[PDB]
Design a protein around this ligand. Structure first.
Ligand SMILES: CC(=O)O[C@H]1C(=O)[C@@]2(C)[C@H]([C@H](OC(=O)c3ccccc3)[C@]3(O)C[C@H](OC(=O)[C@H](O)[C@@H](NC(=O)c4ccccc4)c4ccccc4)C(C)=C1C3(C)C)[C@]1(OC(C)=O)CO[C@@H]1C[C@@H]2O
Ligand SMILES: Nc1nc2c(ncn2[C@@H]2O[C@H](COP(=O)(O)OP(=O)(O)OP(=O)(O)O)[C@@H](O)[C@H]2O)c(=O)[nH]1
Ligand SMILES: Nc1ncnc2c1ncn2[C@@H]1O[C@H](COP(=O)(O)OP(=O)(O)NP(=O)(O)O)[C@@H](O)[C@H]1O
Ligand SMILES: Nc1nc2c(ncn2[C@@H]2O[C@H](COP(=O)(O)OP(=O)(O)O)[C@@H](O)[C@H]2O)c(=O)[nH]1
Ligand SMILES: [Mg+2]
Lengths: 429, 440, 365
């Protein structure tokens, strides 16, 4: 009765999604043959959220993979959990975007999305009641940004009451992976601001530090980083699947996290993370989770809240816990650190506590924050942008594909307007 | 026979319903499968007292209750749990989304398509009653379903039924503790609408029970399975007069009179004095005088509101067990000799008494002790304005910038319905001021 | 530098209400306006920068159509010819008289005709061999946050509501892509175009009326002044422009009393949202004029985004809120009053004026 459509766009989404279904299957006890080998009955009560059913009591995920380079899609099919996906949902084309936002939005995406939307309508109308959507993509590239934001705009017009929850890997400040990230991102934010309800900004630099500083990993690969994002995607949609004392759907977060429509960009986090050795020294109680959650080093956004104020946060807890111990601790954080919170919202925190913890843990917690510290992403991209667009550094690979100088300026202003919309609450009042 | 209907709305009411019916079933002697072997060994009787449990021919006793929500994930702990074979499978739970902490979503948008089905199953239970006493609604300010749907339902019932007492047991939003950034909006819109329809809305604050559980019971890590047994005892102490024999039995209509001077000041507070652990159950006399003064002790109020900053307009006491009236009149005399307890000049009596003979039970697996006496104090104080103002000030701060408004308008709601409601909330605070002023 | 001129107009009774003896609940005391319920429970007081009490033709200061025009609209023409942009918003629930004030009858004209004809007259007076004037017009509507044009012919289809887009020119600010603009020389042409468009404006027979407006109408006049100055040669091309915007908003309407499902509900939701954003922008503009540091959320709605260059800056905004005095429309009346207010509502309770005859307290003194 609360179902989600997962969409995977590009090389950053399709490898997260592969891990995402490798973490939900292990929760609901599903094996790579689609079959059930669980222990409890709760694993199947709300299996209709992410997975559908099949003939021999097999379960097929409601995942829709999209791309323009088949090399990624073929890697998933050969992987461990590839053989459960519906092969008719492996939508691809040819002639990749080439890290060009135009090609993934205007030329090659337009000739492909109509095949994608058919699969969406085919899954959306097989559901009794649709909560929203869940796209996993990446800015800085062509497919995830172009074909992703093109697909968002179409679904939002066709399905306007429903949620479009987005998980997005933003560009890093120090170390790029594509020379034209500021172009491909600023154009994407122009679409996401208007056509989303809740967007989770992830940054790979913050995940490397989490892996090195806390987890004490020496050689972390992308499969480990995604093992941190797959965790947050699940903690958000827990109280739809499993029961608890105080439940919270996706809409119940947005109402309590988006005070003004445009400020839907969030800083995520997950607790409790630790090394394979240090776990003998750290007792898992509710206070230890709350400290790690509000720690600047444990946030996946590559920003620092301590240069700003929290407008509104959320803490989706999982496990047997005392509600007093939760409410006391979230209260103590405000009255101690009032300078990092907003005065004209009397309580800047909500709560949600589920009673079914993860596969091997007594208690866990997910943290979702809306802060004025997120403007440093857009202000940083706005600087790299204008330094390049002012002399037209890489612009002819976009104008040749059906764009003009006009759309670039619209992207800058909506972004620089959003920055100022955040600063007004960052200051004294 | 005299009967009462127990409506349960939202997660905050359902989880209290499971706690109340766990208690009712124990006191009378019912097993979770509806059976009462006591009548099989005795040869029949009204022990399965018809006020709350209706009876069939196979010996099954079904409760007179209805368990509404918009989430499936709460009721489905009941349909799969210990008490699945007790409740009528008509539990009226919506196969759709929730209200997402939105009055507009619970009042109109996804409150319709459901309400008609809820109002029928209530009609069916009422046509089976040979003299109905009233309703008992369990909800919580802060949510959409406990604010919206409860304001939708109480409006329809004032039309069809009208003259029946409609009581509420509500979780007041706390000043510091809260689980939502939009509790105040959903709370001040509710009182705008229920204030014309409900007759007495008892209020509790989760923060005070958290403290009551610490000082007295010595529970530093409580859950909602500990607060709600203690709420279940308040409801039983009210509804005991309809179920068991006693000397002075206070029906529903008598709470509605003694405690509600004017129609708009029907916001009293509840409490329960002998919150005593098993260890401290010894070392105590637990007399009427020791139990009664504790009901006025601010620490043992279930709402964070110092009564000494106000005045008592009316107070109803509900004693239980081995309680002799002479011990009560000595107590109420001792309270009127004090000066930290300042009454209004227009209520020189101030008090009401109820006495039952059926002592409270002990729900196994719990924390409360086996006490032979018990009290439930229901007070109408002018202090509760300080809580109304604290909520209004939270409302005026975040409404001036129209924060969180578009989620309400997006479900069907005019901007002026806030302001209108705000004016309603700014009146009531003057009424509690005027009535507490000494006359000439 | 800017400032919002807020005006409120209380219409008189109609023949139907006079026949039914519908009671009066809106009163005046000079500038202040009050609402006193029939239950005699509460007295609400509103202040606005200007009031127009058209209730009784006898009272001093009875707001004539000329008074309304010369007090609210005509200084916008002064600022226009000075070279500054102007916006006039009209709000009011149906039955209030939002059209009688703005467009008017054939005998008792309104703001639109007085404005346009006075504009033509001042132009004819200022026209010389050195300075010339040029006037273009456009007429669009907003419906469910989408733009449409009102000056095209519906093609041969079941529907030809062709939507358009908004775009931000870096210099000229925002604008509407593909909108047709026509040249005008007389009020005959203006009236013809408007009478064509208001047949296409979205309207439906709701519970409250047979024809209630469900779209925000924008009527724009662009006025270009071409002057000449010595440049040691051919005096040529000193150009100024000014934009006049006349906006007709739709009514709020709650959907909890007015049971309504489907397209009507979506329309009402979008109307309510746009009006909320409009109020936020207006209050932000007031604070900015009073000297605070403020961020104006033009972009949270299409109407605000399109009218950005005609509310902020050195531009002049006026709002006229129309209300009815009858008791049956009291919820709508209080709502419109609260919406039009900018500083604060005042509330009291009083039943002590009836002093049993001729101010009994005087002889008591
Ligand atoms: C037996 C045991 O206790 O070993 C632990 C363990 O040593 C620690 C280090 C685990 C381990 O964490 C990691 O090794 C790790 C490495 C890179 C990135 C992320 C994690 C563990 O992998 C994490 C893993 O926890 C889970 O399995 C959760 O259910 C996790 N599982 C998966 O997602 C999963 C991934 C791939 C295949 C199958 C399952 C999960 C998290 C969120 C939501 C659902 C499930 C467990 C118990 C451990 C190991 C295995 C060492 C911890 O994992 C998490 C999520 O925090 C780190 O702290 C927890 C618990 C322990 O501290
Ligand atoms: N006393 C008590 N309060 C509870 C319990 N569960 C939830 N609440 C209260 O519920 C309030 C939050 O709103 P909810 O009751 O969850 O809202 P709702 O009526 O369930 O409506 P939805 O949230 O949309 O389902 C908080 O103040 C909680 O304290 C409980 O078991 N006992
Ligand atoms: N200031 C006024 N003085 C006298 N009569 C007025 C005044 N304003 C309005 N009226 C009368 O009230 C009517 C209201 O306008 P009319 O357009 O007929 O209905 P309406 O409901 O106001 N249309 P609308 O406001 O768009 O829903 C006018 O036609 C006049 O007859
Ligand atoms: N976290 C994470 N990021 C990835 C992974 N693969 C690619 N990326 C990111 O994706 C960005 C490059 O975009 P790309 O995927 O090539 O765009 P696309 O080709 O259009 O899908 C870089 O910033 C990478 O850090 C991955 O497995 N994990
Ligand atoms: Mg709920």
């Amino acid at each position: 009765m609360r179902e989600i459509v997962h969409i995977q766009a590009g090389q950053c989404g399709n490898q997260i999604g592969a891990k995402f279904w490798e973490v939900i299957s292990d929760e609901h006890g599903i094996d790579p043959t689609g079959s059930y080998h669980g222990d409890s009955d709760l694993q199947l009560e709300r299996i209709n959220v992410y997975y559908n059913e099949a003939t021999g009591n097999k379960y097929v995920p409601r995942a829709i993979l999209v791309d323009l380079e088949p090399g990624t899609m073929d890697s998933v099919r050969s992987g461990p959990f590839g053989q459960i996906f519906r092969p008719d949902n492996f939508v691809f084309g040819q002639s990749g975007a080439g890290n060009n936002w135009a090609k993934g939005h205007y030329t090659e995406g337009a000739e492909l999305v109509d095949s994608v939307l058919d699969v969406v309508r085919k899954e959306s109308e097989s559901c009794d009641c649709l909560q929203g959507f869940q796209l996993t993509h990446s800015l800085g590239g062509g497919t995830g940004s172009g074909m992703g934001t093109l697909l968002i705009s179409k679904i939002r017009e066709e399905y306007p009451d429903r949620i479009m929850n987005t998980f997005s890997v933003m560009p890093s400040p120090k170390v790029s992976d594509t020379v034209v990230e500021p172009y491909n991102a600023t154009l994407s934010v122009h679409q996401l601001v208007e056509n989303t309800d809740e967007t989770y900004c992830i940054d790979n630099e913050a995940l490397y530090d989490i892996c090195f500083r806390t987890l004490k990993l020496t050689t972390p690969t992308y499969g480990d980083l995604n093992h941190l994002v797959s965790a947050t995607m699940s903690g958000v949609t827990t109280c739809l699947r499993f029961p608890g004392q105080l439940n919270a759907d996706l809409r119940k977060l947005a109402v309590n996290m988006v005070p003004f429509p445009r400020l839907h960009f969030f800083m995520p986090g997950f607790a409790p993370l630790t090394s394979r050795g240090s776990q003998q020294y750290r007792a898992l109680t509710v206070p230890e989770l709350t400290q790690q959650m509000f720690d600047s080093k444990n946030m996946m956004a590559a920003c620092d809240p301590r240069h700003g104020r929290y407008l509104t946060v959320a803490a989706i807890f999982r496990g047997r816990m005392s509600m007093k111990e939760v409410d006391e601790q979230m209260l103590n954080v405000q009255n101690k650190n009032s300078s990092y919170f907003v005065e004209w919202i009397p309580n800047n925190v909500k709560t949600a506590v589920c009673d079914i913890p993860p596969r091997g843990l007594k208690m866990s917690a997910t943290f979702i924050g809306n802060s004025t510290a997120i403007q440093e992403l857009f202000k940083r991209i706005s600087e790299q942008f204008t330094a390049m667009f002012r002399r037209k550094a890489f612009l002819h690979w976009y104008t040749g594909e059906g764009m003009d100088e006009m759309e670039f300026t619209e992207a800058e202003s909506n972004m620089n307007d959003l920055v100022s919309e955040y600063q007004q609450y960052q200051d004294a009042t | 026979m005299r009967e009462c209907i127990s409506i349960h709305v939202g997660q905050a009411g359902v989880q209290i319903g499971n706690a109340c019916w766990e208690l009712y079933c124990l006191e009378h002697g019912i097993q979770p499968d509806g059976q009462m072997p006591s009548d099989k060994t005795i040869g029949g009787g009204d022990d399965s007292f018809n006020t709350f449990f209706s009876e069939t021919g196979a010996g099954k006793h079904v409760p007179r209750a209805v368990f509404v929500d918009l989430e499936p994930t709460v009721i489905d702990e009941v349909r799969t749990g210990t008490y699945r074979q007790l409740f009528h499978p008509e539990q009226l739970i919506t196969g759709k989304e929730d209200a997402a902490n939105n009055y507009a979503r619970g009042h109109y948008t996804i409150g319709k398509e459901i309400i008609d089905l809820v109002l029928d199953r209530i009609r069916k239970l009422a046509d089976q009653c040979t003299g109905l006493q009233g309703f008992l609604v369990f909800h919580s300010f802060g949510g959409g379903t406990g604010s919206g749907f409860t304001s939708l339902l109480m409006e329809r019932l004032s039309v069809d039924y009208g003259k029946k007492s409609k009581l509420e047991f509500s979780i007041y939003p706390a000043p510091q503790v809260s689980t939502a950034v939009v509790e105040p909006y959903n709370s001040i819109l509710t009182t705008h609408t229920t204030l014309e329809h409900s007759d007495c809305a008892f209020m509790v604050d989760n923060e005070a029970i958290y403290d009551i559980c610490r000082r007295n019971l010595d529970i530093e890590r409580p859950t909602y399975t500990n607060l709600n047994r203690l709420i279940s005892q308040i409801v039983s102490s009210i509804t005991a007069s309809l179920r068991f024999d006693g000397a002075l039995n206070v029906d529903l209509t008598e709470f509605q009179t003694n405690l509600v001077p004017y129609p708009r000041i029907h916001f009293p507070l509840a409490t329960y004095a002998p919150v005593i652990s098993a260890e401290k159950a010894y070392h105590e006399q637990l007399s009427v005088a020791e139990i009664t003064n504790a009901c006025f002790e601010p620490a043992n109020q279930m709402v964070k509101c110092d009564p000494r900053h106000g005045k008592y307009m009316a107070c109803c006491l509900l004693y239980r067990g081995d309680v002799v009236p002479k011990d009560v009149n000595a107590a109420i005399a001792t309270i009127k000799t004090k000066r930290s307890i300042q009454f209004v000049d227009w209520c020189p009596t101030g008090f009401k008494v109820g006495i039952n003979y059926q002592p409270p039970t002990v729900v196994p697996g719990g924390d409360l002790a086996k006490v032979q006496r018990a009290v439930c104090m229901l007070s109408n104080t002018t202090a509760i304005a300080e809580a109304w103002a604290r909520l209004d000030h939270k409302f005026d701060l975040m409404y001036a910038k129209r924060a969180f408004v578009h989620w309400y308008v997006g479900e069907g709601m005019e901007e002026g319905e806030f302001s209108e409601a705000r004016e309603d909330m700014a009146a009531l605070e003057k009424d509690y001021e005027e009535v507490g002023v000494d006359s000439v | 530098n800017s400032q919002v001129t807020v005006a409120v107009r209380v219409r008189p009774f109609s023949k139907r209400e006079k026949t039914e003896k519908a009671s009066q609940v809106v009163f005046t005391n000079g500038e202040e306006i009050t609402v006193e319920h029939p239950d005699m429970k509460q007295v609400y007081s509103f202040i606005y920068d200007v009031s127009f009490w058209s209730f009784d033709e006898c009272h001093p200061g009875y707001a004539s159509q000329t008074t309304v025009y010369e007090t609210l609209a005509a200084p916008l023409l002064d600022r226009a010819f000075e070279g500054y942009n102007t916006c006039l918003f009209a709000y009011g629930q149906t039955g209030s008289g939002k059209s009688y004030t703005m467009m008017g009858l054939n005998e008792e004209p309104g703001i639109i005709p007085r404005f346009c004809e006075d504009l033509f007259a001042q132009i004819a007076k200022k026209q010389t061999s050195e300075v010339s004037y040029h006037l273009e017009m456009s007429f669009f509507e907003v419906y469910n946050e989408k733009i449409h044009d009102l000056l095209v012919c519906k093609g041969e289809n079941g529907q030809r509501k062709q939507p358009l887009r908004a775009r931000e020119h870096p210099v000229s600010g925002p604008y509407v892509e593909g909108l047709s603009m026509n040249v005008v020389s007389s009020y005959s042409d203006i009236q013809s175009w408007l009478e064509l468009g208001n047949k296409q404006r979205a309207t439906a027979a709701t519970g409250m009326n047979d024809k209630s407006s469900r779209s925000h109408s924008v009527f724009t006049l662009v006025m270009t002044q071409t002057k000449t100055e010595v440049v040691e040669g051919e005096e040529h091309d000193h150009r100024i422009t000014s934009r006049i915007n006349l906006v007709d908003l739709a009514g709020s309407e709650r959907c909890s009393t007015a049971h309504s499902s489907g397209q009507r509900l979506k329309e009402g939701v979008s109307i309510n949202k746009s009006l909320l954003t409009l109020g936020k922008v207006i209050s932000a503009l007031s604070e900015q004029a009073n000297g605070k540091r403020v961020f104006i959320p033009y972009r949270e709605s299409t109407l605000t985004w399109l009218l950005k260059e005609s509310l902020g800056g050195n531009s002049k905004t006026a709002m006229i809120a129309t209300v009815s005095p009858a008791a049956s429309n009291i919820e709508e009346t209080l709502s419109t009053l609260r919406y039009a207010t900018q500083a604060r509502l005042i509330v009291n309770i009083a039943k002590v004026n009836e002093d049993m005859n001729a101010k009994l307290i005087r002889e008591l003194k």
